[PDB]
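Researcher: Going back to the complex we discussed earlier. I've cleaned up the inputs and rechecked each line, so this should be the final set. Can you rerun the prediction on the complete assembly and write out the structure?
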Amino acid sequence: PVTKFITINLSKLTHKVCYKRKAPRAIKEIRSIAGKLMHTKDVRLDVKLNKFIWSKGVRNPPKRVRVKLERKRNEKMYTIVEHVMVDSYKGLVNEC
Amino acid sequence: SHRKFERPRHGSLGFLPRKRCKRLRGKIRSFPKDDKEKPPHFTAFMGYKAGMTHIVREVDKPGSKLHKKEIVEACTIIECAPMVVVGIVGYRETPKGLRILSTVWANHVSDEFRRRYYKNWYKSEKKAFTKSLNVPEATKNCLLKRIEKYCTVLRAICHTQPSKTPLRMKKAHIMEVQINGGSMKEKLEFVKEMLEKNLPVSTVFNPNEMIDVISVTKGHGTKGVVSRYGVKRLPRKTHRGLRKVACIGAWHPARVQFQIPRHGQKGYFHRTERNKKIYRIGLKTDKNSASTDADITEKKITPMGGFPHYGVVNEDFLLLKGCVAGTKKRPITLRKNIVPQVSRDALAQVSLKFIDTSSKIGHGRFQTSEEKVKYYGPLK
RNA sequence: CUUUUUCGUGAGCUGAGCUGUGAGCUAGGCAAUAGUUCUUUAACAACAAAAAAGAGCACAAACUGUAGACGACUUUUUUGCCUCAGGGUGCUGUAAACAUGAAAGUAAACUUUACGAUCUGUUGAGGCUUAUCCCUAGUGGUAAAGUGU
RNA sequence: AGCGUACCAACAACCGCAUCAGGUCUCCAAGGUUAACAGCCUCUGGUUAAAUAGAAAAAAGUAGGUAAGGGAAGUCGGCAA
RNA sequence: UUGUGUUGAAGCGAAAUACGUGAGUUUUCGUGGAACAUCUCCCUAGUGCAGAUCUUGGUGGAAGUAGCAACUAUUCAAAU
RNA sequence: UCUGAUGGAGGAUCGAGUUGAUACUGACGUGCAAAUCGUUCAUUUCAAUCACGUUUAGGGGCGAAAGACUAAUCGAAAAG
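Model: Rerun complete. Updated structure for the full complex:
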């Protein structure tokens, strides 16, 4: 049961993807990354994070997203992924 | 009936089958012929493709339209960290071919060399070469005496040191380099002396020497016949597509001949290319390895920003005129010429005036980062 | 098999003695029997049980992309790798905001105030830069340990 | 007085053997740009559904783009663009 | 005419130290559950199949293959 | 006679829609489809287009004429 703050570079994850699949691919990669980092199969993305990823349409999701992962106890373990509004991304490294 | 118009066949049948190479490492099919009169010497080396640059050299070809003018030539950089001699293999001739009499090993081998024997080195307890290295010196001398008595071909096992390169790979590439030179006794003494120390490029090759390069070409997966064999595209009106060979054989013989070009694997082929001239053997020690007498700047071979897709050349290197098969990071086997060349190109003493070190990413205008910052001045 | 014995080799012993082994010498008496043959069960190699003596990797997984339709192939799994960040190298071309700043001109008050494409300064700025670019024992992480022998 | 009055009208309710990219008559007709009931975008209304999805992404196919220098030398023919 | 069947008929599956030259005949075991022969002689016919792009029915290899491609596009969370 | 307006004729012009079908001899050709899909093209005040109703029936009809059409059937329909 831990909380982590990480930046995800979505540009290199959606680099090879079609126009019509950029935002869904970004969402899928965010889920996969959170699952791998937290070692949980149950990953729930916040609707606000979905809104942020889709805010610019399907064509271009944000290049980087600052996100907060949280492990919760209620197979048993699962993780919430939440958007973190930041003015800038420079100097923002992984935190635990 | 006969062809209306004759044209030569597409591609060479001498590089068949166009299948993937068995291995990544370039393998010598045959070493240069042994000359007993010459002193014992190594005949091959292994390095890694770092990248390409261009140089300026003054031509000395009388009667040529270039002659006294200075020309630009493309060159390939092969990072050549010193190899390590770790083994000796004796070969004797039989009607069935060359037969190994025995291979003896040095008293110590590096973990880099041992890694090559493991598919999963991280989770193993690394027990290879741990108890065969305590063999008695008497048995070693017995094996060496029998090799001297019965063998006619001597090869030294030597391995690269990828830790000295930016490669992600940790297991060393190991190969046999045939010792060409004097008698069997002299060959054995020559290898025994350096049975455990480093073998730099300079002891194997001299500047302005022609060598052959053995490597594996750049892979491209399966490619169509148009790209793989260079056949002509069919006209735009062709019903089921135009990127193919129209007729793949006459009615008889009632089969498809092996000479017909077809779709298949392209690239990742083993190739042995002859007559690449060494323009410079750049040492790791000196800080002006990329400098010339006409430049007198202080700069090393690595272009500003690094060698794209390779890294920084921090070791011994050699500058090969022209191109070399393979991607960056590809292991490249340098072999001595099978027979020494006496042509003017092979014997020419190259005098290079400038070695380019601008950024190979984009269109670099500066040779050094210091020159870049000097030109731009202070910024935010 | 016993007796009289001669010569060569192995165990242990100290070039050398003893025991055994093979061949031989003198003398003796001691056996074969299945009804006329039905292959003369006779070799070689292996195996099983019971007795006596000596004696680790690979796959998967995650990573990689020098590879690739899928397999396969090149790699790494704690001086490594992934990640983000910093730096380098480049690409584009000077961000947003502010300015009794400019601006072809216009209108509206008793010399100022409003509109204004566009331009200027802060600003070679801002943005992007590996996803198959380069450097960094910089941040955080590096997971269950399943399958075959 | 008697009879009809639900619903579809195709987008799966009709005819094409079907929940078939086909066929099948009529009326209403917003805003911006504009000559325009054109094209493109939008408001009301409707929809986000189509005999499938995920991943990878090579050959080849199909539907398109762009190509230095030359400019029909291609081809039966400037077919296609 | 003279026989077999619930102490198991016809049919069917596998067979047989079986007989025949052969079409076949006859037996055994198993299954089956109600009929069956007659070669003593004869009468009668819609009486014998490998084929006919044969008829009807059933079933294969192809093959877990071709393929499930118009109509720009889906995503997050919750309920059942 | 000449000039400028006005006027609004025409089996006049371009052009969506409609009605068709020139070319790619494109796709498809075990199709979405026993004639479709895409682009391109022809056509739009008239010999114009559409609906319903109604008439003409097989050696007959109907034909701005191709032996065309007459219910996927036409150098003689379909059913018995």
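Model: Worth noting: Chains B and A do not touch (no CB pair under 8 Å).
Researcher: Good, that matches what I expected from the previous run.
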